[PDB]
């Protein structure tokens, strides 16, 4: 199947002085493998998976230097953005940043990403061709012009189509035992008689990996969405994920309803009936 490497950065300023918070997390697919958090007093990029822990001291020294450079970058950016938006030092503001690369089943490059948000909304994003930028407002247009003149996208494209995919492939090989295996959902259905007139059917999916899954209800083979509820996929805490989807049905009409599960770890889509 397909794979990704992604880094997520959050920078949160604090009123007046006071250092901003900075947190950096790196993932392969849905597995966290590195972290650095200023709120946890980090001093190094820290491993969080055994396949990365085996990398040697030069690797970790280098990642620690780069994550400290990203932290300083964001410290500048918070000040810069206050200037662009004419904002006081007293308020708290947030910069978010994500970047990384996708590869396919043959592990060849699929897509790259590099994008920013300010205070919870888009700011600037590298378009899909990795040659131009989408700017959300006029402040971001200043960034766009600066980065066009400096040929930033060309530099980032070299990392995105090259270094990223090259290190992703290495990670996927060293972590072949864990990263390259899937855990199919364990599914079951529960019936709770709500009244004499209705009953809730709840279709459960447990201990699956990756997190991507679809749970859908059908009534007599057609898609049914009214009287349904669908919770967000949630982490179990052991690396797997959980999800459920529920539908309220007329008592006596339970057999009209089927729950459908699609997941990369399953040989075929699942159909579950209350019976």
């Amino acid at each position: 199947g397909s794979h990704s490497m992604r880094y997520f950065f959050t920078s949160v300023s604090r009123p007046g002085r006071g250092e901003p918070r900075f947190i950096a997390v790196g993932y392969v697919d849905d597995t966290q493998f590195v972290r650095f958090d200023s709120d946890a007093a980090s001093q190094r990029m820290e491993p969080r998976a055994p396949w990365i822990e085996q990398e040697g001291p030069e690797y970790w020294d280098g990642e620690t230097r780069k994550v400290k450079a990203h932290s300083q970058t964001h410290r500048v950016d918070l000040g810069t953005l206050r200037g662009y938006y004419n904002q006081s030092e007293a308020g708290s503001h947030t910069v978010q940043r994500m970047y990384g690369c996708d590869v396919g089943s043959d592990w060849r490059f699929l897509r790259g990403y590099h994008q920013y948000a300010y205070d919870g909304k888009d700011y600037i994003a590298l378009k899909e061709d990795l040659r131009s930028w989408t700017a959300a407002d006029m402040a971001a247009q200043t960034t766009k012009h600066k980065w066009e003149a400096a040929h930033v996208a060309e530099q980032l494209r070299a990392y995105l189509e090259g270094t990223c995919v090259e290190w992703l492939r290495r990670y996927l090989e060293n972590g072949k035992e864990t990263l390259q295996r899937t855990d199919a959902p364990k599914t079951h259905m529960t019936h709770h008689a709500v009244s004499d007139h209705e009953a809730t059917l709840r279709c459960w999916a447990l201990s699956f990996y990756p997190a991507e899954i679809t749970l859908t209800w059908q009534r007599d083979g057609e898609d049914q969405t009214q009287d349904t509820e669908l919770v967000e996929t949630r982490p179990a805490g052991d690396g797997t994920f959980q999800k459920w989807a529920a539908v309220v049905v007329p008592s006596g009409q339970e057999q009209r309803y089927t729950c459908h599960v699609q997941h990369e770890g399953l040989p075929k889509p699942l159909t579950l009936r209350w019976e």
Binding site: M5, Y7, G26, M45, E63, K66, V67, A69, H70, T73, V76, D77, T80, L81, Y99, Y116, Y123, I124, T143, W147, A150, V152, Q155, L156, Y159, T163, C164, W167
Partner: peptide, 9 residues
Amino acid sequence: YLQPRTFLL
């Protein structure tokens, strides 16, 4: 593997 270059907004 983090990006080795810095670009400021």
